[PDB]
Symmetry: C3
Subunit: 485 residues, 3 copies
């Protein structure tokens, strides 16, 4: 009569990596690196504004394509590649900083700045900024001389921020195609604009000259901006070539901005976005895109990092039981992880030990619950996919992102291998612990055969075997019949 | 007659986190994330100059509030929120870069540039820079036309650097409230400035215009600065609207610049500073301020990460602790592991010094390895008072948040891993003591299953003592014990 | 008659650091932090181009020292400290960004813009750019005026990028010594230069003024650059003080840019370069230069981190090594673990191949996993020769120091952890061998406590050999040994 101990096993198994070995077949494993993508912008539960053809900066100045976003409000702002910030040819200074400001703004709220004028024309328009006939930026005023070639009077206009949050102030310098046109619109003489506050202090002079035609015009209206603190006053002093602001902008609250090219899905929910869609995953790592934003798994270079969720698969190592003095595993033990297999006059019985199985299962389960977590830290865009940022700061950004990518790749690899080593050694420890427990139960009534079996030197029926398995065996009841050998 | 052996335990332990479980009670644990803060700037043994109402940049130009900091010398420079770089309204170009240059300069040393002026007037003053009545920047001079109008003659002034270290040259451009004021101060037509040294070059045209009233005045004097190399000659070609430099600045040595709002305490000593005070700690992590400077523990998001310094606590890997030994002994106060024998003379409970001192030395080794101090000093690249450019600020915040994530992860994983190996370590020591006793008794005792050894012969107190200090001889009792 | 289990040892081991102990002697160890460097630039099979006295930016403008590099092509670009971008005194705007663009460009390819001028001069030369006598930049034209004092007409020359890649458009602004010189060269009045396109706009103006002379000349010709997109059109509207471009530059492919001061060696091959030479190593870390570029081991502050490649050395966690086995056998030079038996035929000592090869395979796996090459190439964002802006330089230095801290911590923790698991691993193997012999002897032998087995029967040499190769039948001797 004998009672052997063993562990389960499967036919195929799954290879993993450890601290000492590469390609260890374990019974079960799960992936930690996300490779699956939702090719949509999951926007369920979030106020979403798809800008489309309106550029994010245009919402402050107001070209015809931005007429519906002049006072938008959203939790998720989507920039599109076909978006344009300007109707009249030009660009912004410190454009990317303002884009990053508006992505988190949660929307904008315009307020009249109270600029009245006397002695100049205030209805400059163009065929590029076309609404009905010929129009201009909805939030701006193209100030021209009162008549053709007349002298533009020296003016100075101020604005007080009576609110509790800073205001976004944008003005424009007009760059004519020639000095003759600048005199035609503003009169002869040098033109100068001065913008001053308590934190800002800059001056601007236009630059007449020929340029390649953009949208059909060779002039260039450029836009500049500042943040006016509460109770602070902004002052402009100008005598021509000045696009005056009409309404200031105030940030509503909180949001996040992404640049994408896939459709919006209001029935899907997500928190991690990139240009190709939404990354929905509980895994701690992802190998989709290093520039993902939101609450995302850490980007890593590796495509797959299998974490072992089971013992070493030994079909037909610190503690020497699994894949040790126990030659192989039991492919039929589908009842648990560790188990008993007895042979007596009734012969051949296989049961499972619930305590050790549930112990290893609880340990690996706690490990998975520790690794499968959420990073509540949100990251926003500092790069730009449609309009590349400056070369130097872009190289610094790329360098930093690559360094962090190296760090997280290392931490992910080392983490996976280490946890796999501890998993295998842990299951081994549980097998050896169960074996030691049975040896301690039988005491002097049985002997070890070296293969994990116990030679019981007395007669042990199915009730006696069941007495061994549930720790009700009393060695003194057999300490003489068994010890007669 | 039996001899048991076990481990110590306490009623109220300390819950820690491990690689495989959260809330494991251990006997003892220590904190690795610092939270206590000294509400003062510990500056003992350091030359400290509190700028107060004086701005760091003003020390180069010299407003009335910086007349005593014109040649300061310190190891720790402290910027205050009430500081101001100017008395006449204006601002510096590349102000933050110059601030970072002055923070680590160890002070400044001025030297007369030797500018003499024939013709033009050089005593321009204002009611914003008040000393005696109306004064100007002590290191600058306001050049004006000879009379109340007419012409300001074109002039060129050149300075040569006769030092071995670079010099700090700071000049100023004056922006009048209107064209009429510029014509009154310096003359009708265009005003032009030109600064040239090689590896530098620039021209400047003033921009008259109405600015908001700061200190009652609407003009704006904005300051520019270059760094002269040895033997390098700088030349200024101007004809008005030029704030001339009177003395150049030289960097003394090395210091550190912090921005705080708490008082200075020369009683305590510290090397890690921030706005709220001084972080004096030996712990490797801190959750006080992510922008701390100097030699600091690495900032982490977590506010508490308990490191286990004891075994698993079991009140009343290797399977001894919390395994076949059902529980621990709160009475065992002499050590971590011990014996408890039951014979004929009574009951005994002693402690084993080898295993206890072994585990204590091991966990002590972990402690010594973890509470390491980093000799890497980090400088200030942000500004709590005057916010930097939005783009470079977003990049700096982005990098700092990335590093914070890295160190938070490393701290969590380190704590959990060290706790796991600590519990497994103590368990291993218990198992090793048990196996040592088992091999020591040989065939004269048996295992009952709960960490005890039934001795099948009479074993008095001296026999138990022989078992404890490993002087027990099995052949002395083999003949009697074998019969059972 | 007894049979003992043991492990090897050496007289003088190597001390390493573990998670719980500093200075643990192990049998063998290997270095993980590289210090040795080849003091040459190993560019075997890379087509190098050593600029020498030519500056990297000059290859776009074409001073006399860059005449042979006007259309260079390479995979590794080496900048020297003696390199100069200019022959006439001047500099570049956004020079560092353009240098970084040219380092990874793989070379440049020039193409004639196709500019034709009328009524003006186009042969402006100088004695500083000395080819035959007085010359100028090969890729530039110095537009002047015919007589000593005429007037530069308002001109506008445009170019259209006809190729499917961006074009580098470098023009120049001339800054004269005085107003009289600028009027002598270009006429009189306010001179302006405008460069427009799709991603660009700007506004350039000269700056006449007194200036110290470099190379005997006080003028300053500065160069500004542009990146036209395919099908994009650039336009220049100028009226004087304009150094016109001649040919445009196109990036050939990809390359690497390093700054070094050592000779070039076409024999050795390397992928990691720094100012001192080439780092040829497979170790995961290096303490040579933190600014090394290419595919390098990660820089760390520590100079040496010894990885344990053997068991703990015990001369004369699982309790076997340095435990109930008192010491190791220096005479066991046949393997890691071995038997030492004593019977009647004499005294024997053999080695066990299973456990030895097992531990060797595990530690070999650790070495194969740690000794790994990083296929991530890092470019040059600093400048050892010219230096960059102070603010972006402080940000770059700050980020680099942070990453260096992270990799130093990870290196320390990695080495200590791997050493801990290695020692515990070999200990585990020894214990497993011991328990295998214990289970193998069944009831015919008894443990002695010091790692040996007292055999209670007569076991000759063939019986010992049967024990060593797992062919010992305990039933052969069970009746004989049971009687004792
Ligand atoms: C394998 O592990 C995964 C963990 O994600 C678990 O969901 C699955 O049920 C496991 N399979 C078996 C057969 O235990
Ligand atoms: C940074 O990398 C992206 C791709 O990851 C590339 O498009 C961009 O051009 C890089 N930045 C610079 C300045 O080249
Ligand atoms: C508990 O750990 C702390 C760690 O600082 C130590 O100071 C203290 O002495 C320990 N207490 C005991 C009873 O070991
Ligand atoms: C960076 O973070 C600090 C607080 O941590 C904040 O005061 C500052 O405004 C942030 N920078 C930017 C550009 O938003
Ligand atoms: C950055 O460090 C290098 C040395 O590693 C030094 O030469 C350089 O001056 C530093 N940068 C700044 C801006 O100080």
């Amino acid at each position: 009569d004998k009672i052997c101990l063993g562990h389960h096993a499967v036919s195929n198994g799954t290879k993993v990596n450890t601290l000492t070995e590469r390609g260890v077949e374990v019974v079960n494993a799960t992936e930690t690196v996300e490779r699956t993508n939702i090719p949509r912008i999951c926007s369920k539960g979030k106020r979403t504004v798809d800008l489309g053809q309106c550029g994010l900066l245009g919402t402050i100045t107001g070209p015809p394509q931005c007429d519906q976003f002049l006072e938008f409000s959203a939790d998720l702002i989507i920039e599109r590649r076909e978006g344009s910030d300007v109707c009249y040819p030009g660009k912004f200074v410190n454009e990317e900083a303002l884009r990053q400001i508006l992505r988190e703004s949660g929307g904008i709220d315009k307020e009249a700045m109270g600029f009245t004028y006397s002695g100049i024309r205030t209805n400059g328009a163009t065929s590029a900024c076309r609404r009905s006939g010929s129009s201009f930026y909805a939030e701006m005023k193209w100030l021209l001389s009162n008549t053709d070639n007349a002298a533009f009077p020296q003016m100075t206009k101020s604005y007080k921020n009576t609110r509790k949050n800073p205001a976004l102030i944008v003005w424009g310098i007009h760059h004519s195609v020639s000095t003759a046109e600048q005199t035609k619109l503003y009169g002869s003489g040098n033109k100068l604009v001065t913008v001053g506050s308590s934190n800002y202090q800059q001056s601007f002079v236009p630059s007449p000259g020929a340029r390649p035609q953009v949208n059909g015009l060779s002039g260039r209206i450029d836009f500049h901006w500042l943040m006016l603190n509460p109770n602070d006053t902004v002052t402009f002093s100008f005598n021509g070539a000045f696009i005056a602001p009409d309404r200031a902008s105030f940030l509503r609250g909180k949001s996040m901005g992404i640049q994408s090219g896939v459709q919006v899905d209001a029935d899907c929910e997500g928190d991690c976005y990139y240009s190709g869609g939404t990354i929905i995953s509980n895994l701690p790592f992802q190998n989709i895109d290093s520039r993902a934003v939101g609450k995302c798994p850490r980007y890593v270079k590796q495509r797959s990092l299998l974490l072992a969720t089971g013992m070493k698969n030994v079909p037909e190592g610190l503690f020497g039981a699994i894949a040790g003095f126990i030659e192989n595993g039991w492919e039929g033990l589908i009842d648990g992880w560790y188990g008993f297999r007895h042979q007596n006059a009734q012969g051949e019985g296989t049961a499972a030990d619930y305590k050790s199985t549930q112990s290893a299962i609880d340990q690996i389960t706690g490990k998975l619950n520790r690794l499968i977590e959420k990073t509540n830290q949100q990251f926003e865009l500092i790069d730009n996919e449609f309009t590349e940022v400056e070369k130097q700061i872009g190289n610094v950004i790329n360098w930093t992102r690559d360094s962090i990518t190296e760090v997280w790749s290392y931490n992910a690899e080392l983490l996976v291998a280490m946890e796999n080593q501890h998993t295998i050694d842990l299951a081994d420890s549980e097998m050896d612990k169960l074996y030691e427990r049975v040896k301690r139960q039988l005491r002097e009534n049985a002997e070890e055969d070296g293969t994990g079996c116990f030679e019981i030197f007395h007669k042990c029926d199915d009730d006696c075997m069941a007495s061994i398995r549930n720790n009700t065996y009393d060695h003194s009841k057999y300490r003489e019949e068994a010890m007669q050998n």
